[PDB]
Amino acid sequence: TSNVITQDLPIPVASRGFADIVGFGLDGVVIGRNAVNLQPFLAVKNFAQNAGGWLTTKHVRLIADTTGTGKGDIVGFGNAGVYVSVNNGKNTFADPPKMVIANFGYDAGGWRVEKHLRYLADIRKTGRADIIGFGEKGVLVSRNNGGLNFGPATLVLKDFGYDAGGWRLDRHLRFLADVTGNGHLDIVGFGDKHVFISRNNGDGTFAPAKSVIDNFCIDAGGWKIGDHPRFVADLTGDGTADIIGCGKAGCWVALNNGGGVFGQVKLVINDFGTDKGWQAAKHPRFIADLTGNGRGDVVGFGNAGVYVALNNGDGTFQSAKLVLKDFGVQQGWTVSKHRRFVVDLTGDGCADIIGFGEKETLVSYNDGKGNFGPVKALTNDFSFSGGKWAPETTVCWMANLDS
Amino acid sequence: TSNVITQDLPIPVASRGFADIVGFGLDGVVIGRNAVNLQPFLAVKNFAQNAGGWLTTKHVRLIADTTGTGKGDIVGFGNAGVYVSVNNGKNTFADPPKMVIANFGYDAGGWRVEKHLRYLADIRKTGRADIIGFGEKGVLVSRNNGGLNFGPATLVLKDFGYDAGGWRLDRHLRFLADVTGNGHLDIVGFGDKHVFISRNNGDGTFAPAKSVIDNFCIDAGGWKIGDHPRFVADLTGDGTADIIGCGKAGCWVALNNGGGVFGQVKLVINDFGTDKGWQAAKHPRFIADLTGNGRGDVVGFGNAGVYVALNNGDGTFQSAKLVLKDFGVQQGWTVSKHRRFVVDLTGDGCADIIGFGEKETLVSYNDGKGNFGPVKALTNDFSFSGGKWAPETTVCWMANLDS
Ligand SMILES: CC(=O)N[C@@H]1[C@@H](O)[C@H](O)[C@@H](CO)O[C@H]1O
Ligand SMILES: CC(=O)N[C@@H]1[C@@H](O)[C@H](O)[C@@H](CO)O[C@H]1O
Ligand SMILES: CC(=O)N[C@@H]1[C@@H](O)[C@H](O)[C@@H](CO)O[C@H]1O
Ligand SMILES: CC(=O)N[C@@H]1[C@@H](O)[C@H](O)[C@@H](CO)O[C@H]1O
Ligand SMILES: CC(=O)N[C@@H]1[C@@H](O)[C@H](O)[C@@H](CO)O[C@H]1O
Ligand SMILES: CC(=O)N[C@@H]1[C@@H](O)[C@H](O)[C@@H](CO)O[C@H]1O
Ligand SMILES: CC(=O)N[C@@H]1[C@@H](O)[C@H](O)[C@@H](CO)O[C@H]1O
Ligand SMILES: CC(=O)N[C@@H]1[C@@H](O)[C@H](O)[C@@H](CO)O[C@H]1O
Ligand SMILES: CC(=O)N[C@@H]1[C@@H](O)[C@H](O)[C@@H](CO)O[C@H]1O
Ligand SMILES: CC(=O)N[C@@H]1[C@@H](O)[C@H](O)[C@@H](CO)O[C@H]1O
Ligand SMILES: CC(=O)N[C@@H]1[C@@H](O)[C@H](O)[C@@H](CO)O[C@H]1O
């Protein structure tokens, strides 16, 4: 398994553990701790549409451990900078939050959701998350120096920027993933003609980009942003991140075989591709371990419901099959109104299914083998409801509040 | 609130948090992680009646953080010494476990459940647990030197031991509690004629015993082990442990000044004592914060049900009253078959009620003011299920696996 950060899933969730619900709703942050008696509570009256003036169009809202206690904190990139509400480890979050650095904000540094990416990750393997942003002139890192002291925002690499050179959210992808196995997140960029790796130097800097694959890109295979989603994930169990994507004809995989260098692209699954009806606008696909393997499996929310193809263990896959007649288009699920995730909720290393639906937060549990049990309702909260939880003005994530 | 270690409750549980179930069953350690879909899993095939030859009459089985990751490990004092299964932070524990010191065991130092006490505590406040034993010649300490290296068992104090001067499990009480207010756990011992305290110096050693109270003892006020239970708990909210006991006429307390000097011994509740029918054999009593204000409240499982008396905040109390018609003698609950605990299950700092009954593990939830809702079944698991979970051959504890 690898700890991986993408654009669509910027909060890493443990392959084996009990994912918690974090909702940035209209009136504040609402926590649904994974627990025997689920009870959402308004934890912080901030970070919200109607409390603090937070907008999905201008701001980024996340969870990460900023103090090192192993407890996840609320983190938001607002106007004047980054704001942190600390988790005190006794189920209470600081309110009001503290502004921890005057950078990475809409007014401080001119960060834009339409041009730039902002991530939180422990890239120095020190137990706290640093701030890393793919900004204008390239990658800017701010080191987390303990007790909410964030060092200067610093240009550590003159690449992968909107203006260094030409990186666009409508053409390219930029992820963090350990492609070498040293436990440090490296940079993976899908550019125009090459997947590039920028290795992690261990000290908050990354080395210059090196081309590793001549596929999976807008001008190298014809891979378009929405239509052909791409992923980084350990598909072999060697602890290093491989590459997999859903094309036209199905799922192509490039296996990592040199601690950061890649084998040739192969079609491993005859499905999940546009050729079989899969559409950016309708059918989210994911990579998750559904078998406790340490290897990633393919999960797709299709028309009739949930499809899955299981990794044998070596990056080859069993045929796709329907495992659950729910959470698909048939049952009213839409990308505009609802959220779906594939995360372990039961600590068995076998990812489960959670959907924030029309009126209910629904779930189906992995039987521990990649099959799923009946759809159960967790709570009325976090659902679209009118929508009190519209994606336009709210944000829901799964996250392990205990690391 | 003050973290405390007692003979009945050697494992500290968070007053605000989500306590997990840990059962040392017939076939191994069964983990019951506090989560939305409680799914007990056989975590380690050891530490058990029929896996490792672990017997309730010879051995001690606990949960403590022995590595400093904040994740509770499985620790057991067996025949040849102390064995640990490390918790890796992803809900898996090493199996088999490994021996970390050939001492403090039935055949390694002649340790006896009938004569000695063995505890795991972070007495040096270094983030991981030392081994503390009250043995033959006094208090033996083994320093957790990291990475499962443990220093030689060293006699740190010639007192509180079976042969120094004559401490007896049928006459006396030995607890760990921070009474002095310096954040370190002190030895609190109820001897013949006095309650003694031994100040934790901070370095792995303990100052000589000092008499602080002429009461609460077998030869000071007529306090008997079975019939008149005693506790240490923060009753005033200053983070400093006070003393409270269920006597004949009710509950008596002596309050801590904040630095280990104790005030008068006074009667604060007219109930919970032998005079009102409370018996060692039938009616377990606890101190837990049922209102989330950081001061301990009294809870007793009597004949008709659960009785409670609420702390005003300063060691004075409201009247006792019955809050729930269950978990009592009349409903079949017996010490010989069943387990009852009062712990926060929901993260609101208000202790809830959980009982391992004849056929089910049942729960009643605190409403946040010390009242309790309808009784719900959490699972068939961990219940007596005759006699899959008999107390003669199995051990159930509550604990916070994630700290
Ligand atoms: C979107 C944004 O930045 N909102 C912040 C709010 O969270 C914060 O509490 C306040 C500081 O007083 O400033 C507001 O502008
Ligand atoms: C979007 C972006 O890159 N903003 C950066 C800002 O964080 C930095 O402080 C400043 C000076 O180096 O340069 C800006 O371009
Ligand atoms: C959008 C894109 O792919 N840009 C890449 C750039 O990141 C990299 O530095 C360079 C290596 O020559 O190749 C460029 O064209
Ligand atoms: C978009 C979608 O749901 N595609 C599925 C395809 O993956 C599957 O192979 C087939 C089952 O026969 O049915 C199609 O509808
Ligand atoms: C869009 C949505 O939420 N669809 C759900 C469906 O998944 C579920 O099977 C059903 C019964 O709970 O309720 C529907 O509303
Ligand atoms: C009660 C006891 O000590 N049992 C231990 C067991 O935990 C261990 O796995 C085994 C192998 O060394 O040795 C046994 O004696
Ligand atoms: C029960 C007990 O105290 N046993 C101890 C043993 O742990 C220690 O190793 C030895 C030498 O100090 O002395 C014994 O009395
Ligand atoms: C059982 C008991 O109380 N023993 C105590 C001993 O621990 C203490 O060191 C001494 C102080 O004078 O008094 C003894 O009687
Ligand atoms: C076991 C018990 O209740 N003993 C108490 C004693 O603590 C108290 O000092 C005394 C006052 O007269 O009354 C006794 O009954
Ligand atoms: C052991 C027991 O249940 N004793 C209770 C006592 O605490 C209570 O004050 C009284 C009146 O409700 O009823 C007694 O039987
Ligand atoms: C000892 C025991 O488990 N007693 C329970 C009782 O508390 C519960 O109210 C009832 C209904 O579930 O079932 C009894 O057997």
Numbering used by the authors:
A (entry chain B), B (entry chain A): 2 to 404
Paper text:
AAL2 was found to specifically bind nonreducing terminal N-acetylglucosamine (GlcNAc) moieties of either alpha- or beta-linkage and was reported to have the activity of inducing apoptosis in hepatoma cells in vitro as well as inhibiting hepatoma growth in tumour-bearing mice in vivo.
The structures of AAL2, AAL2-GlcNAc and AAL2-GlcNAcβ1-3Galβ1-4GlcNAc were determined at resolutions of 2.0Å, 2.1Å, and 2.0Å, respectively. The binding pocket for GlcNAc consists of two parts. The major part is formed by the segment connecting WII and WIII, including the side chains of Asn104, Trp112 and His117 and main chain atoms of Gly110 and Gly111. With the presence of both the polar and hydrophobic interactions, GlcNAc is bound tightly in the shallow pocket formed on the protein surface, with the head of N-acetyl group buried inside the pocket and the reduced O1 as well as O6 hydroxyl pointing outside into the solvent region. Similar metal ion binding properties were also observed for PVL. These cations are located in the 1–2 loops of WV and WVII of AAL2, where highly negatively-charged cages are formed.
